[PDB]
């Protein structure tokens, strides 16, 4: 009755919010494969080492 | 016949010669260029495993 346009306010609020928590929740998912794949990598790169460590 | 044969002898020589030269200096520039990539190449790896290994 009183808050008519500032609810429909937050509606464009939140409506942004799940825009940004969107690319939140993908470019987090982005960075995870990333650091997943390098973690990996790494990960067995340190075995090497760990199993022959050279002179 | 016989300087037929002192000639043939000489064909192949040269021929082979040429075949010989080009085949030489070609390749051993090319193979010398290989040589200093994979010199580089293998050092470039061995002072990853160096670090790695100092990353242990």
């Known amino acids: 009755n009183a808050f008519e346009p500032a609810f429909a306010e937050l509606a464009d609020a939140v409506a942004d919010l799940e825009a940004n928590m969107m690319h939140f929740q993908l470019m987090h998912e982005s960075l995870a494969r990333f650091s997943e794949s390098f973690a990996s990598f790494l990960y067995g790169l340190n075995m090497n080492a760990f199993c022959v460590d050279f002179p | ?56």
Do not use: D, I, P, Y
Request: no cysteine; charged share 10%.
């Open chain 2, 1 to 56: 016949a016989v300087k037929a044969r002192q000639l043939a002898h000489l064909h192949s020589q040269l021929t082979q010669l040429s075949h010989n030269l080009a085949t030489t200096e070609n390749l051993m520039r090319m193979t010398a260029v290989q040589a200093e990539a994979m010199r580089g190449l293998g050092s470039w790896h061995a002072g990853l495993f160096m670090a790695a290994s100092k990353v242990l």
